[PDB]
Amino acid sequence: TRDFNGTWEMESNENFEGYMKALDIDFATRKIAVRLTFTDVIDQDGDNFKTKATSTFLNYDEDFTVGVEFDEYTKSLDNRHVKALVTWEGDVLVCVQKGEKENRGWKKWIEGDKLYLELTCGDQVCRQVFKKK
Amino acid sequence: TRDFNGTWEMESNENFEGYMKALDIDFATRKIAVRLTFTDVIDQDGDNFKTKATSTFLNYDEDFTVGVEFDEYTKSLDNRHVKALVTWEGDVLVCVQKGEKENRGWKKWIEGDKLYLELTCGDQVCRQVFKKK
Amino acid sequence: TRDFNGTWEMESNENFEGYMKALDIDFATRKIAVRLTFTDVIDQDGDNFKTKATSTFLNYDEDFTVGVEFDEYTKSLDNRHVKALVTWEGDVLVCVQKGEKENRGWKKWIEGDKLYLELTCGDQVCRQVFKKK
Fold first, then answer.
1. Are the Cβ atoms of C110 and B23 closer than 8 angstroms?
2. Are strands C6-14 and A124-132 parallel, antiparallel or unpaired?
3. How many CB pairs under 8 A join A and B?
């Protein structure tokens, strides 16, 4: 068919960095464009085309069951192999990521309708607070 | 007028990188801000102001008629001027972009309900598959 | 409570770069990840978790009343402390940012239905024009 009308969400993106490298794009923008997904909207009236490609960030997914130690490759941060276990300690969700780094993990707990998350690695701690919508 | 209330979308941004370099901003973050557009929301209560600037990536637009050679400035990627012509090759939309780069263009075609796009430049080719919403 | 179901919007993110630096993450991806805000969707069925992390850009806010000299931290740009005051020059909103840099500030004014913004620092000036929606 010759009908390209519609809104198209990307499901695959192969050799994006090689194509961008052929265009002489800098390394910083290259490592950021490989972390994006694109949605192209196309209006076609016979031979007249209007196309706009919207770019968004790739959505990171993590599914797990409490008590089952699963293999995790942090494809979002440092790309390392860790073995992660999520445990219940009272009402605090505790997770340990055993690997090259020590004291690495995170801890979640809820207060009212705000979520508190502590990302730990070594002696460094990152604190993030979320509100519920 | 002194009334600044409303939502304001950026249409032009001249010498942003020079201004940021004067602010001693690192090169990586500068190369990320040169690819953004801004939308500012303004609340004005007499002399009271509340401002929020939303940042997004500039979206690539391509409007054309098959067979008509149009001038295209390839923002979002390499910022180059090419002269592009779109042809029908069977049911495949073929486009050639004459410019500094050779073998540069793209090819779209539909199979089933998936859109396939092949971006080529030099000896590098990028393959993209899209699903309809 | 042990119920984490829902959509959680980030409101605070402390020491994200230190945590990422402890993970040996490169400087480019760190300076873009020190931006951004995160929204995590969590579906919890007893002990089974399914999480999706949506990424967007950090907005950065600046709220002020005309005539009060306020402390401003340019988190959107260079992360410096300046003391900024916004003045009226006719119908033009003028603001000067006294700090480590000199001749630093901005000027906004409306003509027709377009907002004109001049970012100045050193001998470099950036001009931005916005249209109203």
1. no
2. antiparallel
3. 109
C127: tokens are 């001009």
Strands (E), chain C: 6-14, 37-45, 48-56, 61-65, 70-73, 81-89, 92-98, 105-111, 114-121, 124-132
* Dmax (CA) of chain C: 63
- DSSP secondary structure code for residue A61 in this structure: E
Write the CB contacts of A113 (distance below 8 Å, at least 6 apart in sequence). A131, A132
The DSSP bridge pattern shows strands A70-73 and A60-65 to be unpaired
- Length in residues, chain B: 133
Check if the beta carbon of residue A130 is closer than 8 Å to that of residue C4. no
Q: Amino acid identity of C34?
A: V
- What technique solved it? X-ray
- The Cα diameter of chain A in Å comes to 64
Closest residue in chain C to residue A106, using alpha carbons only: C19
The nearest alpha carbon in chain B to C101 belongs to B23
**Could you give the residue ranges of the DSSP H alpha helices within chain B?**
16-22, 27-33
Give kind and range of the element (H or E) at residue C1. none
Q: Is C12 within 8 Å of A121 when comparing Cβ atoms?
A: no
Distances from the Cα of C63 to the Cαs of A31, C34, C100, C118, in angstroms?
34, 22, 22, 18
Tell me how far the alpha carbon of residue C48 is from its chain's centroid.
Answer: 36
The 3-class secondary structure across C36-48, one letter per residue, is CEEEEEEEEECCE
Instruction: Copy the structure tokens of residue A100.
Output: 């090259």
